[PDB]
Design a protein around this ligand. Sequence first.
Ligand SMILES: O=[N+]([O-])c1cc(NCCCCCCN2C[C@@H](O)[C@H](O)[C@@H](O)[C@@H]2CO)cc(-c2ccncc2)c1
Length: 767
Amino acid sequence: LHSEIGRLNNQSLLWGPYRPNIYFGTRPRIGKSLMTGLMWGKIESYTDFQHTVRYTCEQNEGMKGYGWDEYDPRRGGIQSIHDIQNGLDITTSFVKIPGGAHGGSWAARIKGTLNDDAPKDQKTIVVFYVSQEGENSELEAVPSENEFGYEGDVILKGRSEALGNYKLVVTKGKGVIPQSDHDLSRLRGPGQTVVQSLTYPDEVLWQAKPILFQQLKAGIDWLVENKYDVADPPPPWQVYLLANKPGSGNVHIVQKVFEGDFEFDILFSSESAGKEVTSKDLEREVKQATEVFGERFARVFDLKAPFQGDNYKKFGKSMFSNLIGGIGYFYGHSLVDRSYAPEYDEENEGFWEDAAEARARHQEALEGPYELFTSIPSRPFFPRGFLWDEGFHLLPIADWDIDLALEIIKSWYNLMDEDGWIAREQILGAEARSKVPKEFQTQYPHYANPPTLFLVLDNFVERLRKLSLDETLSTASVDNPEVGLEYLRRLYPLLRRQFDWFRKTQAGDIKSYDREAYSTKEAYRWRGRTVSHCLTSGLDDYPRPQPPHPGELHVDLMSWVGVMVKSLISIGSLLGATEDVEFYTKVLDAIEHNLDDLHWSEKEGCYCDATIDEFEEHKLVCHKGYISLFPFLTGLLKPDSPKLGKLLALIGDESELWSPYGLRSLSKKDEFYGTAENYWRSPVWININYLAIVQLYNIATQDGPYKETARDLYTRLRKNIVETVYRNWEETGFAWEQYNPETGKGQRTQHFTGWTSLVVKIMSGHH
Ligand SMILES: O=[N+]([O-])c1cc(NCCCCCCN2C[C@@H](O)[C@H](O)[C@@H](O)[C@@H]2CO)cc(-c2ccncc2)c1
């Protein structure tokens, strides 16, 4: 049955618009296969289209906004794009139609509606770009009956091992097609849909924009050679219409030119399924997806007071849909330093300098290929897997569809190497590398990242401990406990590998110093830190011991090990791995003690990181902020704990962490408040705030001395965080990376969906 569900999930999730790095396109979860991409741009002159054409996601003054209104990876959804430069409001509806043996069929409707400021007679060029990679596969444009192009639909017929036989149809669409009276029309036609079928070596097919432009340049060169000139030039839109030349190849360019509003459909028909997909199929299946989307949301994301109103419902749908709509499939080689240079051990004072020298050897090389199916923080700026981000992304996603979340976790864990390392930033293939300066591509096998994916596993375990085919499949791994357990059974070794890996590579040093503590074992130090940064912790510029030092201990890291060990206890125990559960219990106990012995400041009333003095003694270094609260944030303290009580005071203290907009990353009293790049040195970040809220609720709904403070802080923090993110969404249309504690303004990057989307689950409550 486990095997059976896997196959059914496989088949359900195969197709999607799994290209979140571009405005609109599709690919299945297969490295070397069939991909599609949308491009459009207005044309007003002989030289503007190169500047106006849209393809890869960006965000600037020319673009008002864009995103998913509704989305489910099993079903499809609807995306709207508001493009200022091109005076266009676009809608891209996509839908999956199950059947056959190759992962079903799909359709999409591209609708462009000019806005009020656009010339009513604007010419918009639209391209649908189709590529296919693989050795033993074919794809061909059925030729037109007409001389110069297509009056009606474009039919591509194709075949591969993975997809079997299929056809892909670009419909004629609705809208005015401009007509040219020029002499050129005798050779190029008056104006009509055109197709160019080309061949490039497979590994460059992703480069759709240069491939298209090469064709346009060549058409223009032909005009020049053939005496079309400035005495009597064809109109721009005809100069930029490709000579129709359909045939065989691994690239197919389908080009339409419209005057005013337009729409057209894409129909993908898997031959092994029943009849081919039609535009009436599309319309109906879109209406149906909306309905199911609506019904699922009201159930899964039932927003509690005071967010039960419609304004917040719309907000929630937008935040949720953008987060789950970010899901992509990535495939290819990564850049990794496999030297394991000894300088990376950071065992001496001044290690950052040695580590730099090693990096300057540039031993990194490409390896793989790898695949990853994951949600992402940022479509415009970094559309790719980030390890601790994903832990946050999947919390709302698991609510929606635990089986999808398990799938994403599985995908991440399949990256893990023999030693137990997963790169914290997954840059898979040349398309992905195009977004990243070469200088920042290289992953380091000694760089950890918070293991927040355990939090998702935690939530699955509690769900395990306590309809349409799609609805069925979404919860199959909880409803069928045998299946849940087999999944955990298979993942459990890699979890332990990771745990062991943290203990081997991220080890702090007690024994070499005047350090005493309940345990000589439990002590941790993030590898990879520089004078100003600690990227691997995820809190980039949060203030840490100065200077960095091999004797550092980091209270956040130990807390994460604490998270992993509690998770190992629950998972081990479901699998009766008795001897390990004994090992885990001994570790947890040592951490609880060593958190106090090594990290607690009775003086400051919070946890602190620790270094080694110029006199070689263990010195606490206290920077009141997120780090300070870690044992609490990660659920490690007893609800009666006096330490927790002092942390509650710090959290609620306005002069320290408590802004009207949420918890400040760093206290206003801290000497480093607002300094440097001020990334994690004051702003309000949603992911840590989410953790505080969850922990306040836990205390609030349980007997103890702080139940009542916890309740007030929960109530208020939930309110401040949600309302801040809502307020900014209402005014700007965006989720932001972080929020200003002075003004409440969203700042840094937009389209951060992204852990800002946690706000949908904060509104939902009932933890
Ligand atoms: O492609 N660009 O044009 C481009 C590339 C990049 N660089 C990508 C570098 C990786 C970001 C990590 C964020 N990061 C922060 C950490 O603090 C979290 O802990 C960490 O996990 C998350 C992970 O999301 C930035 C911009 C940009 C543009 C305009 N405005 C602002 C920024 C644009």
